[PDB]
Design a binder for this molecule. Structure first.
Ligand SMILES: CCc1ccccc1
Ligand SMILES: [Cl-]
Length: 162
């Protein structure tokens, strides 16, 4: 298991514009296009991202290239953020994947607000961090996704994904 397989399981793959759990236009492996309610705005964002006139549909190769860019961007966002980087650098490789997963889903800004969880993770207080992570809108709105990610932080294993 690696971060790409983990996120592919959590996000799935759709080659036509779809709406995510919050109602936002998305494509591929969880690539957010826009928060605007306008499908035309989403189609324009897609064409800009891919570099051709897509009319709302992409190929599998295009979806996988966008996915690679999005994972790269999530990692860079962690490494540039003075609050996230020290915690990330303190984690083992499996728990680092759980960190990237959260940033991919919620953004650098959203995860950086989980201040109390971050401190517990840096101190390696895994059970306490798991309870704190679950006291969140995130857990209440996407509980199965959140349970898999939290279990990965708690155990440092891939067992939730196997
Ligand atoms: C709150 C999970 C996390 C930890 C470290 C870095 C990013 C995200
Ligand atoms: Cl869920």
């Amino acid at each position: 298991m690696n971060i790409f397989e983990m996120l592919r399981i959590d996000e799935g793959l759709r080659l036509k514009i779809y709406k995510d759990t919050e109602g936002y236009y998305t494509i591929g492996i969880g690539h957010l296009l826009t928060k605007s309610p306008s499908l035309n705005a989403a189609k324009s964002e897609l064409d800009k991202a891919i570099g051709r006139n897509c009319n709302g549909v992409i190929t599998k190769d295009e979806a996988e290239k966008l996915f690679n860019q999005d994972v790269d961007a999530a990692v860079r966002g962690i490494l540039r953020n003075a609050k996230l980087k020290p915690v990330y650098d303190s984690l083992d490789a499996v728990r680092r994947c759980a960190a990237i997963n959260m940033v991919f889903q919620m953004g650098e800004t959203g995860v950086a607000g989980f201040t109390n969880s971050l401190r517990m993770l840096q101190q390696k207080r895994w059970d306490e961090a798991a309870v704190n992570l679950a006291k969140s809108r995130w857990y209440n709105q996407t509980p199965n996704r959140a349970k898999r990610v939290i279990t990965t932080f708690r155990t440092g294993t891939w067992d939730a994904y196997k």
